[PDB]
Design an enzyme around this catalytic site. Sequence first.
Site, mmCIF file in Angstrom:
data_model
loop_
_atom_site.group_PDB
_atom_site.id
_atom_site.type_symbol
_atom_site.label_atom_id
_atom_site.label_comp_id
_atom_site.label_asym_id
_atom_site.label_seq_id
_atom_site.Cartn_x
_atom_site.Cartn_y
_atom_site.Cartn_z
ATOM 1 N N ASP A 1 -77.655 35.297 -128.035
ATOM 2 C CA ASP A 1 -76.303 35.812 -128.285
ATOM 3 C C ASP A 1 -75.323 34.961 -127.482
ATOM 4 O OD1 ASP A 1 -74.358 37.796 -129.171
ATOM 5 O OD2 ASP A 1 -74.573 38.813 -127.228
ATOM 6 N N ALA A 2 -74.321 34.379 -128.151
ATOM 7 C CA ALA A 2 -73.245 33.653 -127.457
ATOM 8 C C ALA A 2 -72.482 34.577 -126.509
ATOM 9 C CB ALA A 2 -72.271 32.996 -128.461
ATOM 10 N N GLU B 1 -62.046 30.621 -118.089
ATOM 11 C CA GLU B 1 -62.914 31.219 -119.090
ATOM 12 C C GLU B 1 -64.244 30.452 -119.152
ATOM 13 O OE1 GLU B 1 -61.360 33.764 -119.710
ATOM 14 O OE2 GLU B 1 -59.243 33.291 -120.138
ATOM 15 N N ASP C 1 -53.659 41.687 -114.604
ATOM 16 C CA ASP C 1 -54.839 42.185 -115.339
ATOM 17 C C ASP C 1 -55.920 42.613 -114.363
ATOM 18 O OD1 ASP C 1 -53.918 41.799 -117.995
ATOM 19 O OD2 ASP C 1 -54.998 39.900 -118.222
ATOM 20 N N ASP D 1 -72.572 37.586 -121.945
ATOM 21 C CA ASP D 1 -71.195 37.915 -121.572
ATOM 22 C C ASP D 1 -71.051 38.022 -120.048
ATOM 23 O OD1 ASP D 1 -70.131 37.984 -124.154
ATOM 24 O OD2 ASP D 1 -70.624 40.124 -124.420
ATOM 25 N N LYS D 2 -71.995 38.722 -119.424
ATOM 26 C CA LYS D 2 -71.997 38.869 -117.978
ATOM 27 C C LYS D 2 -72.301 37.568 -117.223
ATOM 28 C CE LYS D 2 -70.195 42.668 -116.780
ATOM 29 N NZ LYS D 2 -69.226 41.784 -116.084
ATOM 30 N N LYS E 1 -59.902 35.102 -112.658
ATOM 31 C CA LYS E 1 -58.454 35.208 -112.432
ATOM 32 C C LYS E 1 -58.139 35.525 -110.968
ATOM 33 C CE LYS E 1 -57.692 37.029 -117.162
ATOM 34 N NZ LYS E 1 -57.168 38.252 -117.798
ATOM 35 N N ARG F 1 -65.571 39.967 -122.124
ATOM 36 C CA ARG F 1 -66.049 40.714 -123.274
ATOM 37 C C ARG F 1 -66.861 41.967 -122.914
ATOM 38 N NH1 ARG F 1 -66.253 37.631 -128.051
ATOM 39 N NH2 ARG F 1 -67.649 39.257 -128.898
ATOM 40 N N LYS F 2 -66.804 42.354 -121.646
ATOM 41 C CA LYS F 2 -67.509 43.527 -121.108
ATOM 42 C C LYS F 2 -66.549 44.358 -120.252
ATOM 43 C CE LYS F 2 -71.203 43.654 -122.918
ATOM 44 N NZ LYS F 2 -71.189 42.980 -124.281
ATOM 45 N N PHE G 1 -88.082 41.553 -127.670
ATOM 46 C CA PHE G 1 -86.901 40.984 -127.041
ATOM 47 C C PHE G 1 -87.400 39.817 -126.160
ATOM 48 C CE2 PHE G 1 -82.823 42.494 -124.546
ATOM 49 C CZ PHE G 1 -82.321 41.208 -124.571
ATOM 50 N N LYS H 1 -52.643 37.318 -111.442
ATOM 51 C CA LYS H 1 -52.939 37.928 -112.733
ATOM 52 C C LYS H 1 -53.089 39.440 -112.539
ATOM 53 C CE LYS H 1 -53.781 33.465 -113.523
ATOM 54 N NZ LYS H 1 -53.386 32.371 -112.600
ATOM 55 N N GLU I 1 -57.296 27.204 -117.027
ATOM 56 C CA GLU I 1 -56.261 26.586 -116.236
ATOM 57 C C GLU I 1 -56.456 26.836 -114.757
ATOM 58 O OE1 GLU I 1 -55.312 29.104 -118.629
ATOM 59 O OE2 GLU I 1 -55.518 27.592 -120.189
ATOM 60 N N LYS J 1 -79.774 45.483 -121.245
ATOM 61 C CA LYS J 1 -78.718 46.435 -121.611
ATOM 62 C C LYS J 1 -79.228 47.856 -121.412
ATOM 63 C CE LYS J 1 -75.718 45.468 -124.868
ATOM 64 N NZ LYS J 1 -75.049 45.182 -126.190
ATOM 65 N N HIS K 1 -77.339 39.115 -119.226
ATOM 66 C CA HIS K 1 -76.606 39.312 -120.448
ATOM 67 C C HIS K 1 -75.567 38.198 -120.531
ATOM 68 C CE1 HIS K 1 -73.687 40.781 -123.294
ATOM 69 N NE2 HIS K 1 -74.571 41.676 -123.690
HETATM 70 C C1 LIG Z 1 -77.962 42.380 -130.237
HETATM 71 S S1 LIG Z 1 -77.074 40.946 -129.562
HETATM 72 C C2 LIG Z 1 -75.522 41.035 -130.545
HETATM 73 C C3 LIG Z 1 -75.544 40.608 -132.022
HETATM 74 C C4 LIG Z 1 -75.920 39.136 -132.229
HETATM 75 N N1 LIG Z 1 -74.751 38.229 -131.969
HETATM 76 C C5 LIG Z 1 -76.446 38.890 -133.636
HETATM 77 O O1 LIG Z 1 -76.411 37.734 -134.062
HETATM 78 O O2 LIG Z 1 -76.898 39.804 -134.353
HETATM 79 C C6 LIG Z 1 -76.165 41.688 -128.189
HETATM 80 C C7 LIG Z 1 -76.952 41.851 -126.916
HETATM 81 O O3 LIG Z 1 -78.100 42.624 -127.200
HETATM 82 C C8 LIG Z 1 -79.165 42.110 -126.428
HETATM 83 N N2 LIG Z 1 -80.260 41.542 -127.260
HETATM 84 C C9 LIG Z 1 -80.456 40.253 -127.692
HETATM 85 N N3 LIG Z 1 -81.610 40.209 -128.365
HETATM 86 C C10 LIG Z 1 -82.160 41.456 -128.380
HETATM 87 C C11 LIG Z 1 -83.344 41.987 -128.912
HETATM 88 N N4 LIG Z 1 -84.224 41.248 -129.608
HETATM 89 N N5 LIG Z 1 -83.592 43.321 -128.734
HETATM 90 C C12 LIG Z 1 -82.731 44.139 -128.025
HETATM 91 N N6 LIG Z 1 -81.580 43.618 -127.491
HETATM 92 C C13 LIG Z 1 -81.321 42.295 -127.669
HETATM 93 C C14 LIG Z 1 -78.620 41.010 -125.519
HETATM 94 O O4 LIG Z 1 -78.275 41.494 -124.242
HETATM 95 C C15 LIG Z 1 -77.426 40.535 -126.311
HETATM 96 O O5 LIG Z 1 -76.465 39.870 -125.536
HETATM 97 C C1 LIG Z 2 -49.126 34.054 -119.213
HETATM 98 S S1 LIG Z 2 -50.553 33.352 -120.092
HETATM 99 C C2 LIG Z 2 -51.923 33.983 -119.040
HETATM 100 C C3 LIG Z 2 -52.171 33.340 -117.665
HETATM 101 C C4 LIG Z 2 -52.541 31.854 -117.741
HETATM 102 N N1 LIG Z 2 -53.986 31.666 -118.106
HETATM 103 C C5 LIG Z 2 -52.255 31.142 -116.426
HETATM 104 O O1 LIG Z 2 -52.850 30.084 -116.212
HETATM 105 O O2 LIG Z 2 -51.460 31.592 -115.579
HETATM 106 C C6 LIG Z 2 -50.943 34.666 -121.267
HETATM 107 C C7 LIG Z 2 -50.115 34.664 -122.525
HETATM 108 O O3 LIG Z 2 -48.752 34.742 -122.160
HETATM 109 C C8 LIG Z 2 -48.020 33.935 -123.059
HETATM 110 N N2 LIG Z 2 -47.360 32.781 -122.392
HETATM 111 C C9 LIG Z 2 -47.813 31.498 -122.206
HETATM 112 N N3 LIG Z 2 -46.846 30.796 -121.604
HETATM 113 C C10 LIG Z 2 -45.776 31.613 -121.391
HETATM 114 C C11 LIG Z 2 -44.507 31.420 -120.827
HETATM 115 N N4 LIG Z 2 -44.110 30.244 -120.315
HETATM 116 N N5 LIG Z 2 -43.653 32.489 -120.775
HETATM 117 C C12 LIG Z 2 -43.996 33.727 -121.287
HETATM 118 N N6 LIG Z 2 -45.231 33.913 -121.853
HETATM 119 C C13 LIG Z 2 -46.090 32.860 -121.902
HETATM 120 C C14 LIG Z 2 -48.978 33.402 -124.123
HETATM 121 O O4 LIG Z 2 -48.996 34.211 -125.277
HETATM 122 C C15 LIG Z 2 -50.289 33.412 -123.376
HETATM 123 O O5 LIG Z 2 -51.414 33.427 -124.213
#
Ligand SMILES: C[S@@+](CC[C@H](N)C(=O)[O-])C[C@H]1O[C@@H](n2cnc3c(N)ncnc32)[C@H](O)[C@@H]1O
Ligand SMILES: C[S@@+](CC[C@H](N)C(=O)[O-])C[C@H]1O[C@@H](n2cnc3c(N)ncnc32)[C@H](O)[C@@H]1O
Lengths: 384, 384
Positions: free
Chosen positions: A247-248, A46, A280, A20-21, A274, A253-254, A239, A278, A59, A170, A18
């Site tokens: 799908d991008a 990311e 999170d 996202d995964k 991360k 996102r999961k 499929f 972090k 970063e 999925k 998938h």
């Molecule tokens: C359905 S796509 C999401 C919507 C898509 N961005 C679009 O343009 O409609 C989301 C996930 O569903 C699964 N998927 C992709 N193609 C599929 C298909 N033909 N049948 C069932 N699942 C599918 C994949 O794991 C994909 O990442």
């Molecule tokens: C702290 S950054 C997340 C971690 C980052 N990717 C890193 O490299 O450590 C997350 C959000 O915090 C906020 N942020 C960025 N710089 C910051 C700073 N110097 N002080 C407080 N918040 C900040 C921004 O809105 C940013 O999108």
Amino acid sequence: FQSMGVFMFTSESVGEGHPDKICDQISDAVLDAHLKQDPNAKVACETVCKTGMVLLCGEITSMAMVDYQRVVRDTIKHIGYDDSAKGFDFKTCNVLVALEQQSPDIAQCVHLDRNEEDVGAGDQGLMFGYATDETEECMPLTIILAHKLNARMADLRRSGLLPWLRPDSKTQVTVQYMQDNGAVIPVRIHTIVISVQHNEDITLEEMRRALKEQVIRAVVPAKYLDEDTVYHLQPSGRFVIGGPQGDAGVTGRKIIVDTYGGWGAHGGGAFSGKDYTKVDRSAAYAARWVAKSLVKAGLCRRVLVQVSYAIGVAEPLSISIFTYGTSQKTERELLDVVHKNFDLRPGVIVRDLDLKKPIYQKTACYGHFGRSEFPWEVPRKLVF
Amino acid sequence: FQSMGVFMFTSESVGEGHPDKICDQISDAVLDAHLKQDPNAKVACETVCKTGMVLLCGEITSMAMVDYQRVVRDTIKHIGYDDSAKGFDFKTCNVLVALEQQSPDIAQCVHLDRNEEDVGAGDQGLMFGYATDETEECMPLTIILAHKLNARMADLRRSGLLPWLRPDSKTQVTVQYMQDNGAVIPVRIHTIVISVQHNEDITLEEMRRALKEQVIRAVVPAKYLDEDTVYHLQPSGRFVIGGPQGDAGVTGRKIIVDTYGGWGAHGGGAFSGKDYTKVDRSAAYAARWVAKSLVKAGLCRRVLVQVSYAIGVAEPLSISIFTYGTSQKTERELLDVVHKNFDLRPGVIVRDLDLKKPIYQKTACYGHFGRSEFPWEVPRKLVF
Ligand SMILES: C[S@@+](CC[C@H](N)C(=O)[O-])C[C@H]1O[C@@H](n2cnc3c(N)ncnc32)[C@H](O)[C@@H]1O
Ligand SMILES: C[S@@+](CC[C@H](N)C(=O)[O-])C[C@H]1O[C@@H](n2cnc3c(N)ncnc32)[C@H](O)[C@@H]1O
Ligand code: NA
Ligand code: NA
Ligand code: NA
Ligand code: NA
């Protein structure tokens, strides 16, 4: 009985391919690669994927010398994308890198010149931990089953039992529950959905049979499946196009697949890519560990823990404990138990849960919680 | 009283220039641009941002002729990133486009040759709706306050009252609550965090004063603030580097800010960049509308609604209603009320909530729920 208050609850999971995964796994493979050389690497990686493309963005400040081409391509190889027929190939895709140092404004308040124990939270945010006594591993049945269905397809793909299977999958599981004074007890499987990418040679009827007999019946305890269970197997009917081509994909996102499948709650932060500073990640992990330890202490049957932070501040701003009416002790008494038994500063969490160890790619598919090998899944013995 | 069970709960929000939120706004600006020309556009637009870069990635099948350079650059202009001193400039950034048609394998099962009313769910997934009687708009106080703090800074930035303010901001609000037979009642503000990007001319002491007096005291009802309220204002001590330069941004990474701030639950799906056939959006919106309608009917004080789908299937697989002990009618009776009063097929939802209207960029900062102008916020009159 009225007390049983029968209800449905649904969770999903996705497989290694998938998109996202794929991104979560790549972000965590990059993290691991850094930690192997520099245990104190600051990583916020990311990943984005689409037809033919892996983009690394974010970063990193680290003393490691990492071959991003190799790390990315090894990860895609492992997942199983190794030929154009499958929609994606580790050998021939584009890897693009847009990585910079961590902001010095962030560095200066979080960790620069700090003692590790009192390292500041890497950001503000809120994080939850959840546990339920409904399974041995203290996780909802819905999410555990969903994960295992994807893992089973991956196993059968790799063994060659079902060689038409491709990596993008999925699953979705709806369980019928009863309740018992705030606790929940699985009764039966109401509905299962499985969609999995496949080759052009296999028929729909054959795929549907294999998905029921060799995947679902192998994973779901037989007592939960009955004549009225609804099966949506390859509901799309086709499929073939899958992975990043269909799908991008994007890291983080999961979030719900990664955690509790709709149960408990979520604070919004992604885990993958991360390092421990972090919160999170590190605080969500510690929150899970707290929740599980409370259930395994016999202090509750179900529990939700919330914690929160300000950037640069080590100590949590607030901690809250919700037991759904399942504790004999009050939620305030349990908060005292948690304060006596845990230190939720990230610089202590890193020690307790060994969070500089390069095991993060293993977390990035099939759920971060429920699996016995991770330290946050080993309950702490509580004094109370 | 023991019944009041006092507890803390934390939510956050972010401003228009937070890089994740920049992405949501851009993804939704692209959606809107398509819908203005082609009401039936199929859009799945992911945006990624980092220093100097906006990347559009995903799938669009549409008859619209959209100038992606202009849509992106207008959006960044609106947010306020218009000079290199701020870390980002609409005039001089890179806009990169990696957009393809929707997968024909998805198209064929979701919408191809279908009647609009019975359009299939655009994917599997689970979605929740939530409402609480604690505020007039039926939303948690924590999240509403967090949103308003960011909106206030944006207002004062744009008016020139606080001209040192830059677009990237984050807020976090911890409220002390009591409870009343499953309902929740705000008592006081326990902790507030505000971090906002700023210029190099303003002192920390001046920023901190303005954040307390001109932002917090303008937004938070005075009765909730007291001498023991904790204020973490510019806790980092320096936030000059901000926006995409400080942190890579991605669409759908603020899922909890977009919805209920930790309250209720989330199914995992992002809203921004998606047309109504994506139930991640349309069904989450309808679920909110159902939840709010139940509270405004006087049938409960608090409610969580879960719905779920299989790709290509119009009818929800399952619907569940949880009222936290706040309803006189049973949760099963309320599910019957929902079945009698709502049709949660996406092809009916699109009609009820007017989901081809190009209003999506307005949703992509300050929360999708709570604001009175959106159709899913106008309760339906229930027959029961
Ligand atoms: C359905 S796509 C999401 C919507 C898509 N961005 C679009 O343009 O409609 C989301 C996930 O569903 C699964 N998927 C992709 N193609 C599929 C298909 N033909 N049948 C069932 N699942 C599918 C994949 O794991 C994909 O990442
Ligand atoms: C702290 S950054 C997340 C971690 C980052 N990717 C890193 O490299 O450590 C997350 C959000 O915090 C906020 N942020 C960025 N710089 C910051 C700073 N110097 N002080 C407080 N918040 C900040 C921004 O809105 C940013 O999108
Ligand atoms: Na496996
Ligand atoms: Na056939
Ligand atoms: Na505003
Ligand atoms: Na000064």
